[PDB]
Design a protein around this ligand. Structure first.
Ligand SMILES: [Zn+2]
Ligand SMILES: [Zn+2]
Ligand SMILES: [Zn+2]
Ligand SMILES: [Zn+2]
Lengths: 60, 6, 60
């Protein structure tokens, strides 16, 4: 309810792998929901210079 | 990229 | 046309790992000049959802 996943609409907790769409919509998306591998996720967390965007925002 | 891993 | 690296001002050629600052300025940067690893580079260039920004553009 507070942080609805942009795909499954379920709650995005602190102990779950999730990524914010800094590209536009500013919504949180579960890593698993977006179909992102743990390897991609870890690198994205490591790269402060990288900005991620959801399929919806990127298709705009 | 901003992630929950923090 | 020529594309000077945003850091070293040297030419960015096809046989060099280079990344585009899609965040704003749109200058090309040699992967080596940015200090980015090959693994981080591979993920960024392959993933369209993940866009990169140079130090100048990231600091706004
Ligand atoms: Zn989800
Ligand atoms: Zn989005
Ligand atoms: Zn360079
Ligand atoms: Zn830039």
């Amino acid at each position: 309810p507070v942080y609805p996943c942009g795909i499954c609409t379920n709650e995005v907790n602190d102990d779950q792998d999730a990524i914010l769409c800094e590209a536009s919509c500013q919504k949180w998306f579960h890593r698993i929901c977006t179909g992102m591998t743990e390897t991609a996720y870890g690198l994205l967390t490591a790269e402060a210079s990288a900005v991620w965007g959801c399929d919806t925002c990127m298709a705009d | 990229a901003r992630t929950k891993q923090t």
